[PDB]
Amino acid sequence: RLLFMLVLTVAFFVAELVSGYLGNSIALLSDSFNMLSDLISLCVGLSAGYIARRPTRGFSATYGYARAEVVGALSNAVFLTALCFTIFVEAVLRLARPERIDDPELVLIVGVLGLLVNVVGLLILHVMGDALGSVVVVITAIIFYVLPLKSEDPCNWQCYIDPSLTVLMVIIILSSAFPLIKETAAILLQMVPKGVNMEELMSKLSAVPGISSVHEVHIWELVSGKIIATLHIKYPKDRGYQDASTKIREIFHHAGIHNVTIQFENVDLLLLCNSPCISKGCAKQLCCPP
Amino acid sequence: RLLFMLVLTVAFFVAELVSGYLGNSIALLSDSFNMLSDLISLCVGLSAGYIARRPTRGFSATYGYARAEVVGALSNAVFLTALCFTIFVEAVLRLARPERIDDPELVLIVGVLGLLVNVVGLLILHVMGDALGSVVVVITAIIFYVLPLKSEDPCNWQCYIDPSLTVLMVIIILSSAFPLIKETAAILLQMVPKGVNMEELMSKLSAVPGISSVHEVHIWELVSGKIIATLHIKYPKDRGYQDASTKIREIFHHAGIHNVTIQFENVDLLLLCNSPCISKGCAKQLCCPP
Ligand SMILES: [Mn+2]
Ligand SMILES: [Mn+2]
Structure with a gap:
C-alpha cells in the first residue's frame, strides 16, 4: 500500500474549500466536501490496516477493533450525506437567487488541480464518482470564461449552470452513499449476512x-x-x-x-x-x- | 408517550431554515440544524418504540431490530457533527468578512418562535442544549434592533456577535455529540459494556x-x-x-x-x-x- 495521499488530499481539500468560498462556487464546495469524505475514508482504511496485522483482543474489546472499518464507513457515509444536505440547500437557494463566479481562473486552476489528483488516484464508486464532480467545476469555469459576464450586467443563464449541476452531483454522490449506509448498518444492526441463506x-x-x-x-x-x-x-x-x-x-x-x-x-x-x-x-x- | 412534536418540530425546522437564509443568520441555521437533529432523534425514538412492544425476530435479523436506537443515535450524532462542521466553516468566514442581519424582526420572531418550542418540550443534554442555541438568535436580533445599523454604514462590532456566538454554540453542541459518538460506537464495535468489570x-x-x-x-x-x-x-x-x-x-x-x-x-x-x-x-x- 501507499499512504502518500493524505499529504495531497488534505492539502487540496483546504485549497478547494478556500477557493470554493473565495471563488463563489457550490461545485467547488461540493467537491471539497467529497475530498473530505475521501480523506476520512483514507484515514479509516489506514486505521483498518493497523488494526489488522496487529490484533489486540483486549479486556474491553473481546472481538478486537476490526469493526472500525464498518463503523468508520457508516460514519463517513452519514457525514457525506449531511454535507450533501447543506450543499443541496445552498444549491436550491442559488437557483432562486442566482449568483455568479468572481474568479473563474481561480475556480478553473483549482478545478483541474484536484481533477489531476483523482487521476493520480485509481490509476496508480466514490473514487470513480469523485472525478465527475471535478469535471463540473471545470465546466462551470469554462462557461464563465469563454463567455464572460461583466460585473455591471445581471445574472444570465450562466448563473444557473453551477447550482443545477451541483444538484445533479448531490444525486450522484448520494446514489453511492445510500447503498453504503444500508449495507453497513445491516452489519451494525446484528442482521444476518446477505450471503448466508x-x-x-x-x-x-x-x-x-x-x-x-x-x-x-x-x-x-x-x-x-x-x-x-x-x-x-x-x-x-x-x-x-x-x-x-x-x-x-x-x-x-x-x-x-x-x-x-x-x-x-x-x-x-x-x-x-x-x-x-x-x-x-x-x-x-x-x-x-x- | 406523545408524538405531537414532529408536526411542530419539522414545521419550525423549515421555518428557521428559510428565515435563517432569508434573514442572514448563522445562529438561525445552527439552531435549525439542531432542530433537524432533534426531529431525527424523535423519529429514531418513535421507531425504537415500534421495534419494542412488537418484536420481529425474523430470518434476516436474528437479534431483531433493537439495535436501531444505537445505529440511529450514532447516525444522528455524526449527522449533527457534519452539520456543525459547515456551520463552523461559515462562521469563520463571516468573522473574516463580516455581514449583517437584513430582518432582525424576522430573526427575532422565529427566534422566539422556536425557543417557545423547546419550552413546550422537556417541560410537559441535547434538548437542554437546544434552548441555549435559541437564546443566541434572540440575543443577536436584539443587538441589531435596540442598536440599528443603516444599510449605508459599514459593519460595526455587531456583525461579529452572530458568528462569535455561533462558534461557541458549535463547541457546546459538539461537547454533547462527542460523548455520544464514543459511547454508541463502542456498542457497535462489539466492545465490552462499560458496566461489566x-x-x-x-x-x-x-x-x-x-x-x-x-x-x-x-x-x-x-x-x-x-x-x-x-x-x-x-x-x-x-x-x-x-x-x-x-x-x-x-x-x-x-x-x-x-x-x-x-x-x-x-x-x-x-x-x-x-x-x-x-x-x-x-x-x-x-x-x-x-
Ligand atoms: Mn474531485
Ligand atoms: Mn432551538
Missing part, C-alpha cells in the same frame, strides 16, 4: 440426525468473512452429540460460517431453553425473550 | 471448581440491559459440568449478563479450542484466530 441453512440444521430441537440461532457478521453463529441445540440424554456436532459445524462450514458456538441442552415444555438466566425475572432482560 | 468477572470465571480452561470469552452489548456473552470452556471428561454450568451462569447473573452461551469442550495443546472450523484453512477466517 438462512432458509436452506435452517432447513439443513433441523435435519441433523440426533438433534431434537434448535433455538437461539443467532448469526451475525463482524467483518467480511468473519461470521459468528451462536446456537442452542437440544438433544436426547441417552445419545451423544459428537457426530451431531461434527455435522452441524460442517453444515455451517459449507455456508461460509466458521465461528460457530453451540450450546447443547439436554432433553412443548421440551422446546424452550433449559438454561435461561438464573432467575425468572431475567426474562425481561433476555434477548429472544421467553 | 471484565477483570473481576474473568478472575471469578477461572475460579469455578471443575473448570480447566476458559477461551473465546466474547462479551458484547446489543442494547442497554441486553448483554450477550459467548464463551467456550474446557472440562475434564470424567466430571460433569452441571454444577459448573450453574456457577458460571450465576457468576454472569451477578454481573448483569443474562444472555450466556457456553460451549463445553472436553479434555499446552490442551488449552486451544477443540472445535474450530472443520478445516485448518479456516484459521484465517476465524475470529480470535489460532
Whole structure:
C-alpha cells in the first residue's frame, strides 16, 4: 500500500474549500466536501490496516477493533450525506437567487488541480464518482470564461449552470452513499449476512440426525468473512452429540460460517431453553425473550 | 408517550431554515440544524418504540431490530457533527468578512418562535442544549434592533456577535455529540459494556471448581440491559459440568449478563479450542484466530 495521499488530499481539500468560498462556487464546495469524505475514508482504511496485522483482543474489546472499518464507513457515509444536505440547500437557494463566479481562473486552476489528483488516484464508486464532480467545476469555469459576464450586467443563464449541476452531483454522490449506509448498518444492526441463506441453512440444521430441537440461532457478521453463529441445540440424554456436532459445524462450514458456538441442552415444555438466566425475572432482560 | 412534536418540530425546522437564509443568520441555521437533529432523534425514538412492544425476530435479523436506537443515535450524532462542521466553516468566514442581519424582526420572531418550542418540550443534554442555541438568535436580533445599523454604514462590532456566538454554540453542541459518538460506537464495535468489570468477572470465571480452561470469552452489548456473552470452556471428561454450568451462569447473573452461551469442550495443546472450523484453512477466517 501507499499512504502518500493524505499529504495531497488534505492539502487540496483546504485549497478547494478556500477557493470554493473565495471563488463563489457550490461545485467547488461540493467537491471539497467529497475530498473530505475521501480523506476520512483514507484515514479509516489506514486505521483498518493497523488494526489488522496487529490484533489486540483486549479486556474491553473481546472481538478486537476490526469493526472500525464498518463503523468508520457508516460514519463517513452519514457525514457525506449531511454535507450533501447543506450543499443541496445552498444549491436550491442559488437557483432562486442566482449568483455568479468572481474568479473563474481561480475556480478553473483549482478545478483541474484536484481533477489531476483523482487521476493520480485509481490509476496508480466514490473514487470513480469523485472525478465527475471535478469535471463540473471545470465546466462551470469554462462557461464563465469563454463567455464572460461583466460585473455591471445581471445574472444570465450562466448563473444557473453551477447550482443545477451541483444538484445533479448531490444525486450522484448520494446514489453511492445510500447503498453504503444500508449495507453497513445491516452489519451494525446484528442482521444476518446477505450471503448466508438462512432458509436452506435452517432447513439443513433441523435435519441433523440426533438433534431434537434448535433455538437461539443467532448469526451475525463482524467483518467480511468473519461470521459468528451462536446456537442452542437440544438433544436426547441417552445419545451423544459428537457426530451431531461434527455435522452441524460442517453444515455451517459449507455456508461460509466458521465461528460457530453451540450450546447443547439436554432433553412443548421440551422446546424452550433449559438454561435461561438464573432467575425468572431475567426474562425481561433476555434477548429472544421467553 | 406523545408524538405531537414532529408536526411542530419539522414545521419550525423549515421555518428557521428559510428565515435563517432569508434573514442572514448563522445562529438561525445552527439552531435549525439542531432542530433537524432533534426531529431525527424523535423519529429514531418513535421507531425504537415500534421495534419494542412488537418484536420481529425474523430470518434476516436474528437479534431483531433493537439495535436501531444505537445505529440511529450514532447516525444522528455524526449527522449533527457534519452539520456543525459547515456551520463552523461559515462562521469563520463571516468573522473574516463580516455581514449583517437584513430582518432582525424576522430573526427575532422565529427566534422566539422556536425557543417557545423547546419550552413546550422537556417541560410537559441535547434538548437542554437546544434552548441555549435559541437564546443566541434572540440575543443577536436584539443587538441589531435596540442598536440599528443603516444599510449605508459599514459593519460595526455587531456583525461579529452572530458568528462569535455561533462558534461557541458549535463547541457546546459538539461537547454533547462527542460523548455520544464514543459511547454508541463502542456498542457497535462489539466492545465490552462499560458496566461489566471484565477483570473481576474473568478472575471469578477461572475460579469455578471443575473448570480447566476458559477461551473465546466474547462479551458484547446489543442494547442497554441486553448483554450477550459467548464463551467456550474446557472440562475434564470424567466430571460433569452441571454444577459448573450453574456457577458460571450465576457468576454472569451477578454481573448483569443474562444472555450466556457456553460451549463445553472436553479434555499446552490442551488449552486451544477443540472445535474450530472443520478445516485448518479456516484459521484465517476465524475470529480470535489460532
Ligand atoms: Mn474531485
Ligand atoms: Mn432551538
